[PDB]
Amino acid sequence: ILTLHYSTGALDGDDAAVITILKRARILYAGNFLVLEYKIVADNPRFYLTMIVNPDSIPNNLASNTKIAFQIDEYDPDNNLCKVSVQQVLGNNDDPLINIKAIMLDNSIVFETNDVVEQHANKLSFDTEEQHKAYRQDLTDLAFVTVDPTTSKDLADAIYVKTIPTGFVLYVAIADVAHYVNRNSEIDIEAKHKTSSIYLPGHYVVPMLPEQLSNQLCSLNPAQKRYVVVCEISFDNQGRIKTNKLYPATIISKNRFSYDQVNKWLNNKSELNCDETVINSLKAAFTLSDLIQAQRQKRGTIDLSHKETEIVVDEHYFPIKINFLVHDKAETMIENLMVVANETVAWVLTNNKIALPYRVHPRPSKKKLQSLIETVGELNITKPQFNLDTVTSSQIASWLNENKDNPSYEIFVILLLRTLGKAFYSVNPLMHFSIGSNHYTHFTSPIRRYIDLTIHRLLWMHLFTPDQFTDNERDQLKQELEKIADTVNDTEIKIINCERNANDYLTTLLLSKQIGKTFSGFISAFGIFMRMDENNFDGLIIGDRLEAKLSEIDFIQKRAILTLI
RNA sequence: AAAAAA
Ligand SMILES: [Mg+2]
Incomplete structure (x- = not known):
């Protein structure tokens, strides 16, 4: 290839x-249609072919500067000529939302509504008798709550934490998506194709499942009875796991909190209008979370945190400003509880000899580490003493920690992440080196990840109600696991590229209003890249500090051109 | 190109 x-x-x-x-x-390409002589300028600057547009594929009244998708039906290798035909009209080429949809098309990401799939989803309803199954524990009395970003309408996880004299009991309740989505149904097939939900700025979301499930029937919305799968974990007073149980349940979330509400409550800048049982559960959750974090740091885990940003857009999808994200205390509490549930479910399935898709991140090779060691040693970052074949998560963490004060710590973390490579899904039991565990999977987000849905299916078919499934049903799913992981891995690459294309498009659209401003920053990487402090975006002209002026936006390549003071 | 909620 x-x-x-x-x-x-x-x-x-x-x-x-x-x-x-x-x-x-690909079969479809995005481009701008221009007009009589017809021309298409492909959105992708790597599309280098000269195009002769077939006039019979163009609606007669289709005007210049319209975003379209075209396909190649035939090509001629002797004249470097190709014929292209218009297949879709997307809208005005200057409209930022149209450009975001064009970017999705260029990355092969489905975003248009599937009328057949939504009609199937609108047929689903809440079965009141499911709560009376002998296997489903009624937990509707417990003060579960959700904590999520303010704008989310898909809430897959709820938590309740109780203090006991010997320690803590954690309940992680995950929406029971497998109860509503039958394997190989029309809805399931579409979800498997998408493999995950897509989140773009302005809270523009392409959901893995249609809205009546993702935001209604499975979304653990406040005051609604909801069916869930619970991971219940008992901890000692040091945060060490003693026992665990997994089981289907029924809950009623008592409150829908935002991270912002909980963090301000933490700093006594505000108060939560909720029952004292909710207050006491949140207090125990934070106490438990600090203990879990300390235990994970003791056993070994690599904090690869670095600068991250988001682009705020208005109601017409025009960009307003760039914000630096703050993985704060409340976000950290949720992450600690979700990770321990994920890790526990991985071990339960492994202990029971059930094949599953793990979330893996292998140890990097000695050669790659050596190359990395060579590149960075040039940059006032200590040289590590550990053996490169045997290096543990703790040793990488310690290396990062003893350099937390290096002025170029930010660029250090970036190169280590590449050296470490991409996480992925695998049925083979590989470690997750950066998390620090020998077994890990994704269990807590089945409304928006197909792997989590598969994990729920495995629990149901092997542990919760094996009598309602045949040995051929279990083997049918087992045989498909490696293909599911492959499809999810392949699609994750496309999704990451789509978001990157979209962030570059919107950030340069915002910067195009700012020729006239000077910027400070350093070098991230034909020329010098400079990352501006105010927006974390690289302009084109490692670690040296520079100051530079924004001279133009290159809209062909979606790049910011800077000039040295 | 890690984790988590999206
Ligand atoms: Mg959530």
């Missing part, structure tokens, strides 16, 4: 020369 000598019409993802194309990476 080919990545973009310059002189046989092959494209990205389809010394040597290309002889033939076995399979195109």
Whole structure:
């Protein structure tokens, strides 16, 4: 497969020369239509072919500067000519939301509503008798709550924590999505294709499941009875796990909190209008969370936190400003409880000899570490003493920790993450090196990740109600696990590229209003990249500090051009 | 290109 000598019409993802194309990476391409003589300028700057537009594919009244998608029906290798045909009209080429949808199309990400799938979803309802199953514990009396970003309408997890003399009991209640979505149903097939929900700025979301499930029937909304799968974990007073149980349950969330509300309550800047049972559960949750964090740091875990930003857009999808995100205390509390549930479920399935898709992150090779050691040692970052074949999560963490004061610590973490590589899903039991566990999976987010849905299905079919499934049903799912992991892994790459394309588009749209401003920053990486302090975005012209002026936006390549003072 | 909620 080919990545973009310059002189046989092959494209990205389809010394040597290309002889033939076995399979195109794409069938549709986004572009701007211009007008009589017709032209298309592809959105992707790596689309280098000259295009002859078929007039019979163009509605007669379709005007210039309209975003379209086109396909190649045939091509001619002797003249570097290609024929293209218009397949979709998307809208005005200057509209930022239209550009975001074009970016999705260019990354092969479905975003248009599937009328067949929504009609199936509108047929679903709340079965009142499910709560009376002998296997489903009625927990509707417990003061569960949800803590999420203010704008989310998909809330998959609720928590309740009780203090006991010997320690703590944690209840992590996860929406019972497998109860509503039958395997190989129309809804399931569409979810498996998407593999996850998509979150773009302005809270524009492409949901893995349609809204009546993701935001209503499975969303653990306040004051609603909801069916869940509970991970219940008992801890000692040091935060060490003693026992665990998994089981289906029924809950009623008592409150829907935002991270912002909980964090301000933490700093005594405000108060929560809720029952004292909720207050006491939150207090125990934070106490338990600090203990869990201390235990995980003791056993080994790599904090790869670094600068992150989000782009705020208005109601018409025009960008307003860039915010630096603050993974604060309340967000940290939720993450600690979700990780311990995820880790526990991984071990339960493993202990029971049930094949599952793990979330894995292998130890990096000695060679890659050596290359990294060479690159960074040049940059006032200590040289580590550990053995490179045997290096533990703790040793990487200690190396980062003893450099927390280096002025270039930010760029250090970036290169280590690449050296470490991408996490992925695998049925083979590989470690998660940065989390610090030998077994890990994704269990807590089945409304928005297909892997979590699969994990719930495995629990139901093997542990909760094995009698309602056949050995051929269990083997049918087992045989598919590696293909599910592959599809999710392949699609995750596309989703990451789509968000990156979209953030570059919106950030440069915002910066195009700011030719006239000077910026400070350092170098992140044909030329010098400079990352501006105010927006965390790299302009084009490692670790040196610089100051520079914004001279132009390159809209072809979606890049910011800077000039040295 | 890690984790978590989205
Ligand atoms: Mg949540």
